[PDB]
Homo-oligomer: 33 residues x 3
Amino acid sequence: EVEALEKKVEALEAKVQKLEKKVEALEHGWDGR
Amino acid sequence: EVEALEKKVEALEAKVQKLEKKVEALEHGWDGR
Amino acid sequence: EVEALEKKVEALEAKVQKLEKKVEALEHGWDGR
């Protein structure tokens, strides 16, 4: 279970990093947003 | 601890999926955004 | 591993809560968004 949870957490870390970048871009209006 | 962490990770997966849908909608301007 | 995963999950919970607040603000146009 721990091996599977670790993979799930790592996938979440990647997805959350991507969301943070997109949301900061929206908040800041970067690149014409 | 693992049982509680698993529930926390599953809740995160649901929340992150929801955020991805909302952020793609904002980025794409879907439905008048 | 479980101790490290727990810290990672807790950090994700904080980041996801922050994203939910920012995305709701964008969706609702709060504060001039």
